[PDB]
Design a protein around this ligand. Structure first.
Ligand SMILES: [Mg+2]
Ligand SMILES: [Mg+2]
Ligand SMILES: [Mg+2]
Ligand SMILES: [Mg+2]
Lengths: 166, 166, 166, 166, 166, 166
């Protein structure tokens, strides 16, 4: 299988505000995505951290989309029903095609986690295609991100990139 | 855990026609919802019964939304593919935010019931948020309503109400 | 249980091009659909083969819809994320009502097939209602079509036809 | 021509807050609508005053829609681009059918007013049909309301009610 | 200037029913369209007559779209607010791209006709593009069809066909 | 009246291709916008030139939206029915609120020009609000841009900016 190039975006107001104050931050979810993607033979070619702000989130995504070498963009954060969760409403609109089934299949595997169960209906984690690039909008939770990567992204992303570019 | 205030809406033309004549009605599904809610420490602060009529359905929901003390509205009926089933089409247009995953997660738990299985794809049961209130639109079937309450609403609704109001 | 009348549409550019040249084609998925329907007491009252072309797909479907005796239309092909897959985007527009849950329940059954698993989120197989006729848009894959027929269509299609004509 | 029955809704936060404090209010726009509708042989069968609040606006409309004798509902207020203008976004969704051309034709006649001109593109005044009733969502401005009534509503509303009920 | 090939579709339930009975019909609007097109150097390469039935309307349009030589499809009938008027709702779905401004510019020219004026907001006449073919959905009214042809279609249709095939 | 800060975006593949080679460019439409704005006391705080490419268009707009000091963004190009015109389809998906009437009011003033007339229905020029900023998407034609600026933007934009920020 090909090594693919990934850009990672963390959407977290608390962490962004610390970055502004030059304070130490731990980005557990972003770290997990990088670690797993690298462990599996892929490359991280960029990373950004933004708060729950429409314009800032759009700029983070367009910056990544504008790098020709990027194959896949993965974000973590802002896909639930907190009043300030706006990631899906901001980005999903931009997809050339929504990968419609990613949302329900992610909720299916989430429902199977005995620590999640019915909480599965409280995520809007989504995937789509823009140009020849794939985009995954994942939850803030480290366990959720790990689940999405291992069960859904790592096994199929190669074939999906191939397919979209065929 | 917090006692929450619920408003129950039964959508049934046959039962509504009896109501108009003050003839006896058995509302099995509405009664199941009320009983399960009370057994779990919640309160029923309102109830209404309407037929499959767009205006009457809209009024039933707006009358409930107008009560400041209501936290959650649950309806039963009119969420399938009978020509006269219009509940979801009517009330989705009120949502501030659709709780998108409720539909497929409800169909997942329904499919898993060996008495239901593939019949799961014949429901459009849905949920959403209007203001600081949660709305669940459930099937007419007593067994479907019991499943939704026990497996999906009772376990998650407290945290969901908190989240939407945070 | 009614014998129902089915019209079968294969959407395959490679096979269509062979047709034009008057060469042998082998349509495994269409053949599977026909055999499983007949074996279950249903009738095949028409069949057509078209490429991934919008107008030709629309014509195939409207020709079938224009036959009063047709109860159900089932197509195979063009429901994935290949750049040329346009079946769902083309026909889903024509639905009076989308049978919304067919998509996710199909992906649920697909995901539980140990040979498919995560590949489940790469399909957009869908169903809908036009007039008093039911329409299923299935994948090109022979295994997917068998799964859809055995698990979802054959068990519920009788009741669904009844229901929409109620 | 028939005498038709109208329900008038004023959407104004300032006026609503005075009503709560039992203070005198002047509703110039509502008064103009009543006066002109009555001068032209029609009847006013109800009136309500609400602020720019989604739930309160929905309740005002459903209350009017639920009166069988009502033929037409006319509202004034909240159809522009103030952050708090939400009338169109709240009600337009509820239409069975939008009367699509009302919006642009109203902007056409507004553009012709030498005191409005290009300000015409800053209104979203709209019309639609719910059940057998017509709904007009008009601006807050008295001159705008007068214009809508004289040029668009009074001349055509009779035929439109007839048509919708045919 | 190209001679273009036009297909003409009349949507009229009363005239269709006469056809079935083999009685004389008189189609004034279709006749106007044909005469004005021919008089302007264009060709009529097909014609059909259908009632206000979704499937029959879809079949009329797809039959025309399936003729390679057809450049433009023009229909007359079913674009108002009669409960049986379904032309726009049916065909507008099929557009690759809606020619968005045809609707309001048609209503502008209509409004300026001193015999139409405010009746202008009661039409939904529309235009769109499917493949490399242009489609105009015009009212049933003979005067409306003449106006559309003379003021909007004949002057711009050549350039529009050129443009979409660019 | 307030001096406002504008960001001008030219969308032209031919000019962008020249830019890449640092070949001379004449951008008549962009220059007209800049000149009229400056003559009316406004400031140009940014400019970019992009081709008809979805990602590049999205980046141009997000780079402008990211400048706190920008009040209004005006683009020229790609708002017609050429197959490669994608400006409106791309940027409408960014709007918080579409300024719905800008489209038809622009077509009204365009139709009124005797050099344009029915050509008015071949544009999709649009406007919207993102955050506290206004966005106008104008045609490529120099005469169209001049008309939009003088008749629709310069007279109303000051009050509109105030309103959106109130
Ligand atoms: Mg665990
Ligand atoms: Mg059981
Ligand atoms: Mg005046
Ligand atoms: Mg001039």
């Amino acid at each position: 299988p090909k090594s693919l190039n990934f850009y990672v975006i963390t959407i977290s107001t608390s962490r962004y505000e610390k970055l502004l104050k030059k304070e130490p931050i731990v980005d557990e979810s972003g770290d997990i995505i990088k670690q797993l993607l690298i462990e599996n033979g892929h490359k991280i070619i960029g990373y950004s951290l933004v708060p729950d702000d429409k314009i800032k989130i759009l700029k983070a995504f367009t910056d990544a989309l504008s790098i020709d070498e990027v194959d896949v963009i993965i974000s973590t954060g802002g896909t639930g029903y907190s009043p300030t969760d706006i990631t899906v409403e901001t980005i999903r609109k931009l997809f050339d095609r929504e990968i419609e089934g990613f949302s329900d299949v992610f909720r299916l595997v989430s429902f199977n986690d005995p620590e999640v169960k019915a909480a599965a209906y409280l995520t809007k984690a989504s995937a789509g295609i823009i140009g020849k690039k794939i985009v995954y909008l994942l939850p803030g939770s480290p366990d959720a991100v790990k689940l999405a990567l291992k069960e859904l992204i790592l096994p199929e992303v190669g074939h999906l990139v191939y397919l979209v570019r065929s």
